[PDB]
Amino acid sequence: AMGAAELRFCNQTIKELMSKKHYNYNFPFLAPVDTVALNIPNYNEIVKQPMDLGTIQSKLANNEYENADDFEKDVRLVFKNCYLFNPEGTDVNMMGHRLEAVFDKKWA
Structure with a gap:
């Protein structure tokens, strides 16, 4: 896994x-895409890999990133x-x- 200093930075x-500071534009990305609600049944078979911010946080906590x-x-x-499915x-x-x-x- 990554070093302690980078782990702290990635967690931040x-x-x-x-953060709730961005609630008006992060809501689409916090949890897995609702493919039923959005009528995109083949989403997982189209994207290279599905991902959401909560899963990134959980992967980081489980030391998944080298x-x-x-x-x-x-x-x-x-x-x-996002851009693949939203023009x-x-x-x-x-x-x-x-x-x-x-x-x-x-x-940066």
Whole structure:
């Protein structure tokens, strides 16, 4: 697993993305996609791997990431999956870009 200092930073980062400070645009990403509610039955077979912020937090807590780059890859996957299913200009697409910008600022 990643070193202690990077683990702390990644924990802070995922908590930031999930924070109530961003409640108006992180809600689509906190938990697994509701494929029934969204009428996207083949979602899991289309995306490379499904992912959500809560699962990233749980994977981090179980020491699943070898380094912080691997943590970043899962964050990017959340947003890649967003844009694959939500066209540019739509509400959820824009929320994804806004939350990804929060990540980019923290990660820079």
